[PDB]
Design a binder for these strands. Sequence first.
RNA 1: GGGUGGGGGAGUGAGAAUGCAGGCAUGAGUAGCGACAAGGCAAGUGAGAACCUUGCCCGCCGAAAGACCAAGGGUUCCUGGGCCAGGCCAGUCCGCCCAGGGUGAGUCGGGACCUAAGGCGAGGCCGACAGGCGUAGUCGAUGGACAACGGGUUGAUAUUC
RNA 2: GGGAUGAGCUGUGGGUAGGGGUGAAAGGCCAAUCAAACUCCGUGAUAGCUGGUUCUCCCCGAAAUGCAUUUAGGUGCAGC
Lengths: 113, 116, 42, 98, 54
Amino acid sequence: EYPSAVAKARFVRVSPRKARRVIDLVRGRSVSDALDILRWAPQAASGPVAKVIASAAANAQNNGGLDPATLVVATVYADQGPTAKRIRPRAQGRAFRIRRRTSHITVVVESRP
Amino acid sequence: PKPTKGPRLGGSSSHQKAILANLATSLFEHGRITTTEPKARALRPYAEKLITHAKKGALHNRREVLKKLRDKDVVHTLFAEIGPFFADRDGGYTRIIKIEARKGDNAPMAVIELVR
Amino acid sequence: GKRTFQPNNRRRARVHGFRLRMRTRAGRSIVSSRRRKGRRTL
Amino acid sequence: TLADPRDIILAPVISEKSYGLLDDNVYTFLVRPDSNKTQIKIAVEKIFAVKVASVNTANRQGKRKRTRTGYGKRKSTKRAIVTLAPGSRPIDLFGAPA
Amino acid sequence: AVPKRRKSRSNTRSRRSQWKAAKTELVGVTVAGHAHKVPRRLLKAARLGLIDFD
RNA sequence: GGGUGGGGGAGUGAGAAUGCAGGCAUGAGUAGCGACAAGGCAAGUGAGAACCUUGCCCGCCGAAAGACCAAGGGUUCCUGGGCCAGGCCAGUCCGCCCAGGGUGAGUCGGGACCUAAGGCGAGGCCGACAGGCGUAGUCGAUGGACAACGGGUUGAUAUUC
RNA sequence: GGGAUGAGCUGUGGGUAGGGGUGAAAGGCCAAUCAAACUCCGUGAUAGCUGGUUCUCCCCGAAAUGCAUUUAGGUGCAGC
Ligand SMILES: [Mg+2]
Ligand SMILES: [Mg+2]
Ligand SMILES: [Mg+2]
Ligand SMILES: [Mg+2]
Ligand SMILES: [Mg+2]
Ligand SMILES: [Mg+2]
Ligand SMILES: [Mg+2]
Ligand SMILES: [Mg+2]
Ligand SMILES: [Mg+2]
Ligand SMILES: [Mg+2]
Ligand SMILES: [Mg+2]
Ligand SMILES: [Mg+2]
Ligand SMILES: [Mg+2]
Ligand SMILES: [Mg+2]
Ligand SMILES: [Mg+2]
Ligand SMILES: [Mg+2]
Ligand SMILES: [Mg+2]
Ligand SMILES: [Mg+2]
Ligand SMILES: [Mg+2]
Ligand SMILES: [Mg+2]
Ligand SMILES: [Mg+2]
Ligand SMILES: [Mg+2]
Ligand SMILES: [Mg+2]
Ligand SMILES: [Mg+2]
Ligand SMILES: [Mg+2]
Ligand SMILES: [Mg+2]
Ligand SMILES: [Mg+2]
Ligand SMILES: [Mg+2]
Ligand SMILES: [Mg+2]
Ligand SMILES: [Mg+2]
Ligand SMILES: [Mg+2]
Ligand SMILES: [Mg+2]
Ligand SMILES: [Mg+2]
Ligand SMILES: [Mg+2]
Ligand SMILES: [Mg+2]
């Protein structure tokens, strides 16, 4: 419908739930507002998400030649990436597993008046 | 001044005493200090009372200040520049400005500075 | 709080070494069996 | 069958320590690990027509490295440090000026 | 005490959706002509130049 | 690589065995983050600093939480790089990763000297076979004998240079 | 809290091996397991006991009684 651009951040080392917590803050907002919302968000996952949104806006402006002032974060979500498994020793010889989860973050921005 | 209600900074009360003394020394030495917001709020009245002692500026007041500060150079500058500078101002010698929190623990931070 | 394994290289050699094994036919058969299985260490 | 002293001395050691010793007129070689000090002294005297004061030896274990899943060990070496007599003609290492 | 049985999807999701971040309200400030957006509690620091906008 | 038809043959059908292997949920962004010595500020480096570097304060050990060995470990040591794995957080740092370097003895600790407990044991005695024991002898320190001290130097060795 | 010049504590080296050792004696200890260690082999031990046994439709359809039993929660013959 609208001209758009896409950016993806694969294998980002942040848990998908933690990434969703901050994505829900900026879903649907304009790029300018989303960028500074993530700038002032105290959560650590605000960094990678801001980077992906900025990269998508850059893609739209460079490749698509769209006006940056009209870009809106239309679609954004975080899928699960591969998970690495570790071991944490516990009392009386028990060994518990530890998961190092990663995320795939996808952002679509489109330009509209 | 009014005692801390709730747990004391840096563990115990003796550690809090040391922390306040060190922060006051650094503040008088540099004129401006960046630290955690609770520490700045705890420091403010503690430092103003020492500045009041320096404004009075007698031998008795110098001994009173030395009861707390161990840096004699800082004591000298406190009694030679800071007190004379604030001779004409009645209270309110410091100022707290809130700044961005730091990574690692998201601790709220602030700067505290002498008014001039 | 003392654990069962207290390493000592000389005692390990004198208790489980090649020259100990070769001294009796049981040890020689153990060595031959490990050779047969294809172990790297005998 | 016939033995040559050049079978004992393999190659010179090139490093900052060796270059430092070269100024003091002390030469570091890699030797065959089975050799001994007296044999090394005789061999150096024969090879370079020089006078040798004393020979110092040291065995160095090879480093362990891992390549994809397991560890492999480099070869162990023996170094001989040879100090010439006080006033002997220098050994020309032929490319090691220090 | 251990769970007697696993939770249903709806029961898990009702609780899980309550773990969310609160958004900070931002005001407008201009420094050296360039206009930024900062949390209001940092307005004084932004005016005095102690804020690194990156 | 398959369909259909006439025949032939099956490791031929799983939902349960507190079944086995792999993947993934629930508990849940929850408990925990490993001693009760304690950290702070200024400056620096950097994309990024509570944790790294420098300085100055403050505190703790000081019959150890200091300094040397033996056993054990095995390059963990030094220099130069690195930062997706590891470090219960982050890390520009590291006992982590990569490359190169580094251990110098007539006197130090051992062998080439000596023997204890004990081991092995020519012949030998005993034992259906297998083998048991043991003499001559030969090994075996935790012990006996035996010759060096002070200073300097490297990024890394020093009673060794 | 007990002993702390002794029937003391401890380092290094050595010896005793499974119906065997060792034990100021508790069936204690013999590599986190001991009223007979561990490993491999006989071996796919045995279990009147417990659990499990996977696609379909059509027709019919019980028994929990008798006798015997080292038998009674098993089985043989009869009955259905
Ligand atoms: Mg354990
Ligand atoms: Mg009170
Ligand atoms: Mg006290
Ligand atoms: Mg030949
Ligand atoms: Mg010498
Ligand atoms: Mg030597
Ligand atoms: Mg390596
Ligand atoms: Mg409870
Ligand atoms: Mg088919
Ligand atoms: Mg056919
Ligand atoms: Mg089957
Ligand atoms: Mg299945
Ligand atoms: Mg199952
Ligand atoms: Mg709960
Ligand atoms: Mg907690
Ligand atoms: Mg800790
Ligand atoms: Mg700083
Ligand atoms: Mg190091
Ligand atoms: Mg890292
Ligand atoms: Mg980490
Ligand atoms: Mg014998
Ligand atoms: Mg014989
Ligand atoms: Mg003997
Ligand atoms: Mg001997
Ligand atoms: Mg000895
Ligand atoms: Mg050193
Ligand atoms: Mg008594
Ligand atoms: Mg006593
Ligand atoms: Mg023994
Ligand atoms: Mg037995
Ligand atoms: Mg009894
Ligand atoms: Mg036991
Ligand atoms: Mg038995
Ligand atoms: Mg059989
Ligand atoms: Mg019917």
